[PDB]
Amino acid sequence: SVSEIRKAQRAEGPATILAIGTANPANCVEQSTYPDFYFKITNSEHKTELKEKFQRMCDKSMIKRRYMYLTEEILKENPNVCEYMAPSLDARQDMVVVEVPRLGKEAAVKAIKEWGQPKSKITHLIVCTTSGVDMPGADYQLTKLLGLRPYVKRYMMYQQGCFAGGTVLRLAKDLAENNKGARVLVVCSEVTAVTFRGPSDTHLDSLVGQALFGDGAAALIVGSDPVPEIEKPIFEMVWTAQTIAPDSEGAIDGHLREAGLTFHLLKDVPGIVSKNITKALVEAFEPLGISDYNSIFWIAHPGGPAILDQVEQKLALKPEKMNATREVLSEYGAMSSACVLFILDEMRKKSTQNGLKTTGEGLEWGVLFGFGPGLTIETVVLRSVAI
Amino acid sequence: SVSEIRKAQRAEGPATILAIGTANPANCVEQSTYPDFYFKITNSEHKTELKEKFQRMCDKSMIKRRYMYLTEEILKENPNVCEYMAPSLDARQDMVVVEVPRLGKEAAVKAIKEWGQPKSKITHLIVCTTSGVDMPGADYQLTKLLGLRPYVKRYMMYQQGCFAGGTVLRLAKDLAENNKGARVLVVCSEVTAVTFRGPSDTHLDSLVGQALFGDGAAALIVGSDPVPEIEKPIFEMVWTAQTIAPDSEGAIDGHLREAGLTFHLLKDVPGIVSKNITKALVEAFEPLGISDYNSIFWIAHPGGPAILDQVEQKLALKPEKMNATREVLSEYGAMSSACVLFILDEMRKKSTQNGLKTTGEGLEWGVLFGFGPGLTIETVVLRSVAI
Numbered sequence: 001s002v003s004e005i006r007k008a009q010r011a012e013g014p015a016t017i018l019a020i021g022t023a024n025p026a027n028c029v030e031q032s033t034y035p036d037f038y039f040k041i042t043n044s045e046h047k048t049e050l051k052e053k054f055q056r057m058c059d060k061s062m063i064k065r066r067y068m069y070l071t072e073e074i075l076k077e078n079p080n081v082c083e084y085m086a087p088s089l090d091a092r093q094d095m096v097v098v099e100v101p102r103l104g105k106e107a108a109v110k111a112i113k114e115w116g117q118p119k120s121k122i123t124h125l126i127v128c129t130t131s132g133v134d135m136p137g138a139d140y141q142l143t144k145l146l147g148l149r150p151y152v153k154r155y156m157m158y159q160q161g162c163f164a165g166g167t168v169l170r171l172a173k174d175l176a177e178n179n180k181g182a183r184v185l186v187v188c189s190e191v192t193a194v195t196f197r198g199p200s201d202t203h204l205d206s207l208v209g210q211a212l213f214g215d216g217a218a219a220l221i222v223g224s225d226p227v228p229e230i231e232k233p234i235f236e237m238v239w240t241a242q243t244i245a246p247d248s249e250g251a252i253d254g255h256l257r258e259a260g261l262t263f264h265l266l267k268d269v270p271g272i273v274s275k276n277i278t279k280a281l282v283e284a285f286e287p288l289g290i291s292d293y294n295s296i297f298w299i300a301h302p303g304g305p306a307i308l309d310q311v312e313q314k315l316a317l318k319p320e321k322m323n324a325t326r327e328v329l330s331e332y333g334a335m336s337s338a339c340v341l342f343i344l345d346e347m348r349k350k351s352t353q354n355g356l357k358t359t360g361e362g363l364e365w366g367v368l369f370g371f372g373p374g375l376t377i378e379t380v381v382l383r384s385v386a387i
Numbered sequence: 388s389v390s391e392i393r394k395a396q397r398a399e400g401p402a403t404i405l406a407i408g409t410a411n412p413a414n415c416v417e418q419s420t421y422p423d424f425y426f427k428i429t430n431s432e433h434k435t436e437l438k439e440k441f442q443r444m445c446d447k448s449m450i451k452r453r454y455m456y457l458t459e460e461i462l463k464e465n466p467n468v469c470e471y472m473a474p475s476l477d478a479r480q481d482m483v484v485v486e487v488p489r490l491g492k493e494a495a496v497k498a499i500k501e502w503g504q505p506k507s508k509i510t511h512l513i514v515c516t517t518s519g520v521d522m523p524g525a526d527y528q529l530t531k532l533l534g535l536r537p538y539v540k541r542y543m544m545y546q547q548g549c550f551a552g553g554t555v556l557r558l559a560k561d562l563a564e565n566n567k568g569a570r571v572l573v574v575c576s577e578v579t580a581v582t583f584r585g586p587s588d589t590h591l592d593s594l595v596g597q598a599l600f601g602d603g604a605a606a607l608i609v610g611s612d613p614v615p616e617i618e619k620p621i622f623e624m625v626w627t628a629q630t631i632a633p634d635s636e637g638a639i640d641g642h643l644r645e646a647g648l649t650f651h652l653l654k655d656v657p658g659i660v661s662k663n664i665t666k667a668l669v670e671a672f673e674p675l676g677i678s679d680y681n682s683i684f685w686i687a688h689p690g691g692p693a694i695l696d697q698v699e700q701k702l703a704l705k706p707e708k709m710n711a712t713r714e715v716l717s718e719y720g721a722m723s724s725a726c727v728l729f730i731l732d733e734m735r736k737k738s739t740q741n742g743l744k745t746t747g748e749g750l751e752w753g754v755l756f757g758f759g760p761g762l763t764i765e766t767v768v769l770r771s772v773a774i
């Protein structure tokens with residue numbers, strides 16, 4: 001009886017990513033000229049030293065542009081958003097409670113189109129965001145916007161931060177694998193309207209966030225037991241882990257206050273990530289018998305370029321390993337949770353477009369990393385799919 | 388290879404609740420005298436009509452007392468919290484970012500003691516709260532406070548609302564069932580310091596929340612494949628669902644603003660719940676061949692007494708079905724997500740104490756309901772355990 005129900009209820013194979021679709025606000029912000037725009041829009045042109053400092057951060061960022069919900073016209077109507085710290089949460093919340101599900105919606109409609117199956121077959125819905133919170137949440141708004149069934153099972157992940165691209169995958173794996181037929185829509189939608197703020201020379205950590213963060217959503221359809229020649233696997237999830245690096249208390253903290261979401265960097269993030277990445281890698285791939293980290297395909301949250309460079313240096317990865325990750329950093333900036341999902345998209349499209357044998361750059365096994373508050377490391381083990 | 392990994396990775400039996408422990412702030416607030424305390428502490432004694440209205444709500448509430456982090460001494464130091472709508476989120480956040488994990492901690496240490504196994508066997512941690520958000524979140528604070536392993540896999544459910552006692556169970560089921568050996572610590576910790584506010588005669592819905600909400604945490608250890616005679620099952624989870632009632636847009640909304648968390652009731656919650664409960668029940672128990680709702684044991688989020696009375700009337704449940712739920716309402720008030728978990732505790736202790744044959748009041752099959760924003764209904768199907 002209960003064991004017979006349990007056997008009939010559960011799926012059989014590994015959770016598989018079966019579609020990926022992305023969206024970004026229409027406003028494109030060039031990085032090259034960004035320090036002049038940002039310092040003028042925040043009435044900080046008098047702060048010469050600080051500005052110079054910010055131009056060096058933007059030039060070193062390895063970001064060419066970012067898409068941003070916030071425009072100059074929005075910023076001229078919200079001077080409290082332009083100050084470093086002024087009461088402004090109600091204004092930010094009003095932007096992102098709407099923008100998050102609207103952008104989410106765009107991304108999900110593309111993934112759903114790629115998937116090709118009836119949206120009423122969507123059984124579970126994971127929404128993930130670091131901007132804004134609301135009740136009913138963005139999961140409820142998206143259910144309504146997309147026309148999903150009313151009984152879809154919802155997972156609203158609010159205020160998670162930069163590692164949550166790995167969390168959503170970790171979550172989606174167990175939902176798809178334990179429920180026969182389940183098809184998970186995963187939406188990660190991040191708008192920086194909640195974090196934008198003016199510059200202050202005693203809060204340079206906050207200034208780094210202003211050079212690096214950008215907006216965007218990605219959506220996946222995740223499922224086990226794909227219907228062959230009807231659904232088309234892209235990646236398979238095999239294993240996951242989540243861990244907190246030692247000696248990293250306060251490395252990446254973010255508080256939602258009356259003045260919005262503030263971020264504070266209190267340790268050395270690039271050096272904590274580098275120092276701990278090997279540990280993560282051995283815990284993942286030692287049971288797979290693999291020890292050569294240039295033989296797997298990589299996905300790494302690009303929390304800025306120094307994380308990437310210090311991980312590549314640490315392990316002696318060839319320069320090419322981080323190509324997809326850096327191509328996403330270049331074109332969109334760090335989109336918090338959505339970022340690693342754009343990198344899966346970027347990798348599978350490039351491998352397919354270039355005639356490679358797998359969606360994992362020609363390779364079989366892959367890794368995806370999420371880095372963020374705690375200092376937290378999310379690891380997902382992937383296997384590519386032939387062709 | 389991947390199928391062999393998948394077979395070795397997954398658990399076998401149904402997710403089982405193996406310990407439950409609860410905690411509440413030490414301040415006990417009598418309901419009988421509460422309208423005099425509340426109207427004086429919010430400088431609203433001049434509002435006679437409103438006060439009378441509130442005394443009738445408190446007398447009708449069927450709540451004898453509630454435990455509250457907020458004291459008069461805290462309230463005299465935060466007059467902005469005492470007003471209906473004054474800027475006060477930073478003050479509330481500072482209370483609940485600390486109180487949530489501290490209260491959570493108390494509850495979890497009791498469940499962990501009851502469970503009896505090494506805390507290092509805790510593989511997953513679900514924290515659920517509707518009060519406050521922070522990064523790193525309360526999941527991270529609790530990992531640290533309890534000494535859990537650094538690699539515990541964390542699920543931070545922020546700003547979920549009153550149905551999330553059913554969500555956490557739905558989540559815990561799939562984590563325990565898909566991962567061999569996994570042992571889930573589930574903590575639901577709700578402090579109303581984020582919602583307390585003064586009275587306003589054009590916002591009576593907000594006034595209802597002030598009569599009903601109270602604080603508290605509950606913790607569970609959830610696992611499949613219990614080790615017989617080492618771990619002691621209390622309830623087994625068989626099936627879950629989550630759904631959004633038709634025609635309920637805006638029934639229970641809650642916005643986190645600069646003035647704190649506000650709640651708004653825009654429809655008839657008791658009549659929406661009653662009207663839809665039968666549907667939920669048939670979707671759950673029709674595949675079990677059961678149609679007599681007095682033959683299963685009940686657990687219902689007591690979002691106030693009218694929900695309970697209108698559900699009991701609708702279905703013709705004997706008065707006794709809602710005994711445990713109402714005993715928790717009586718002693719603690721509505722503790723949001725934690726509430727239904729206190730009711731499982733209350734039911735299994737009473738059945739054991741009174742010599743009944745199961746922990747489900749002598750009965751085999753049971754149901755737990757979560758009601759909240761959307762208008763959302765969470766259903767969990769339970770089976771009791773012998774003795």
Ligand SMILES: CC(C)(COP(=O)(O)OP(=O)(O)OC[C@H]1O[C@@H](n2cnc3c(N)ncnc32)[C@H](O)[C@@H]1OP(=O)(O)O)[C@@H](O)C(=O)NCCC(=O)NCCS
Pocket residue numbers: 053056057060061062204205208209252263265269270303304305306307
């Ligand atoms: C910011 C970044 C793009 C600059 O690239 P870079 O290769 O490191 O370039 P540089 O070393 O010349 O330094 C850039 C500026 O960062 C500033 N900076 C970065 N972290 C700082 C900190 N904790 N305190 C003070 N300044 C800091 C420096 O003052 C420096 O300005 P400078 O020219 O006056 O000296 C790189 O530092 C980076 O990727 N940082 C991100 C790390 C991170 O934690 N991201 C987390 C997201 S919240």
Ligand SMILES: CC(C)(COP(=O)(O)OP(=O)(O)OC[C@H]1O[C@@H](n2cnc3c(N)ncnc32)[C@H](O)[C@@H]1OP(=O)(O)O)[C@@H](O)C(=O)NCCC(=O)NCCS
Pocket residue numbers: 440443444447448449591592595596639650652656657690691692693694
């Ligand atoms: C509040 C409650 C405890 C009172 O019990 P009761 O059996 O219904 O008692 P009564 O019908 O005499 O009414 C109590 C007061 O509720 C007030 N009330 C409740 N909902 C209201 C609404 N939407 N608009 C105005 N007043 C409302 C009434 O004005 C009434 O005051 P009264 O004596 O001036 O007329 C019961 O209404 C209840 O359980 N409400 C909860 C429903 C709910 O949505 N909970 C969701 C949590 S956010």
